[PDB]
Amino acid sequence: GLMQFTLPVRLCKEIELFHFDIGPFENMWPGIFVYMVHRSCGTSCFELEKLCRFIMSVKKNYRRVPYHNWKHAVTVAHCMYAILQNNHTLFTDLERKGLLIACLCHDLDHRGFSNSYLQKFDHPLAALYSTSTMEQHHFSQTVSILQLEGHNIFSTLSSSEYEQVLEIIRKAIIATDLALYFGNRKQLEEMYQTGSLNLNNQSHRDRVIGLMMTACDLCSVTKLWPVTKLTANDIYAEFWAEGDEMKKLGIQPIPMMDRDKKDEVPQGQLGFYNAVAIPCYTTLTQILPPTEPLLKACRDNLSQWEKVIRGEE
Ligand SMILES: CCOc1cc(F)ccc1-c1nc(CCOc2ccc(C[C@H](OC)C(=O)O)c3ccccc23)c(C)o1
Ligand SMILES: [Mg+2]
Ligand SMILES: [Zn+2]
């Protein structure tokens, strides 16, 4: 009850900022996540023993892939922590519990391949889940781990509160399917601009939590340039492996995934910032004004990618 997690001074200060990097020491990430749950949620939200056992089983079920790994999970959870802490009064007790857990769990047992590749390979998961293939698997793995003995971090909720939090976690994890993001943001755009966006409307909340999940999932584009630049190597390591596997199925991969077209990377990042990231953090800053540092950092990185293209690095 009286056992607080504390962090060294630099982390204690820097963790409050959107652009925080959790660092290269894996053994500190669980402590970082618990610190964020205790300040974001309370010290009583979860039984520490259950939380610790939950965190370590989640970690165990992330794979050693270049990008969609345990570090990505904690990174995505930290971005959500920063949003939640900068919008204190807007979210319910249950949303704060569910969203940090959703973010830690959002890519559980990812193999480093897109939904597309699973579908062209004819992976069993593509038979079982026709759309948002990996995301329905990620949620399924979340429920599995929650059902391990000693792992029910929600045990103290009512029956109906339990179903609400698992429903928040399900929608949050599905929303990380970037195919669903485009429509979701367009709707939030129209609702915000016609003044119909209503945070007491549960279907409106769901959409806004969906956009937060995309914002947290893409948060590599909101770091200081050297972090953004080095993460892009991990991202493309996975994409190029997938392109290789496409070529093995006798399919020319899109140029993004083709490691023979590395030269096209800076222009592909431009396209991605213009088509995906900038619109994402724009609509998010409109709906949640305190998230503006994410938009500003994203624009700075867009400018760094233009500089790469102009041969200025
Ligand atoms: C894995 C998570 O993805 C990232 C996370 C990051 F922190 C930074 C970059 C990517 C990243 N993802 C991609 C792959 C997805 O790429 C795209 C998806 C959708 C569209 C938009 C498309 O309209 C043009 C649409 O609506 O589908 C893109 C447009 C230009 C370039 C890449 C695009 C790239 C190149 O960089
Ligand atoms: Mg994912
Ligand atoms: Zn992710």
Domains of the chain: 28-310 (1.10.1300.10)
Structure tokens at 153: 């971090």
286-296 burial string, b = 16+ CB within 10 Å, else e? Answer: bbbeebebbbe
For 189, list phi and psi in degrees, rounded to 5: -55, -60
d(C-alpha 263, C-alpha 258), whole Å? 10
Going by C-alpha positions, the residue among 24, 52, 25 that lies closest to residue 37 is: 52
CA distances from 257 to 103, 237, 260 (A): 26, 9, 9
Burial of 199 (0-12, 13-18, 19+ CB in 10 A): exposed
Atom of ligand 1 nearest to the CA of 220: 7
d(C-alpha 267, C-alpha 234), whole Å? 17
Distance 115 CA to ligand 2 centre (A): 9
Say yes or no: CB of residue 220 within 6 Å of ligand 1.
yes
CB 157 within 8 A of CB 150: no
CA 256 to chain CA mean position, Å? 21
Experimental technique for the deposited model = X-ray
**Size of the chain, expressed as the number of residues it contains:** 313
d(C-alpha 100, C-alpha 40), whole Å? 9
Say yes or no: CB of residue 278 within 6 Å of ligand 1.
no
Cα angle at 245 between 131 and 272, to 5 degrees? 60
- 107 assigned ligand-binding residue: yes
144-177 burial string, b = 16+ CB within 10 Å, else e? Answer: ebbeeeebbbbeebeeeebebbbebbbbbbbbbb
Question: What contacts 183, CB < 8 A, 6 or more positions away?
Answer: none
Query: Resolution of the deposited coordinates, in angstroms?
Result: 2.2
d(C-alpha 215, C-alpha 176), whole Å? 9
Structure tokens at 202: 């549960």
Structure tokens at 6: 């504390």
Distance 311 CA to ligand 3 centre (A): 31
Structure tokens at 80: 């959500």
Crossing angle of helices 133-147 and 48-60, in 10° steps, is 140
109-136 burial string, b = 16+ CB within 10 Å, else e? Answer: bbebbbbbbbeeeebebbeebeebbbbb
Structure tokens at 209: 């939590």
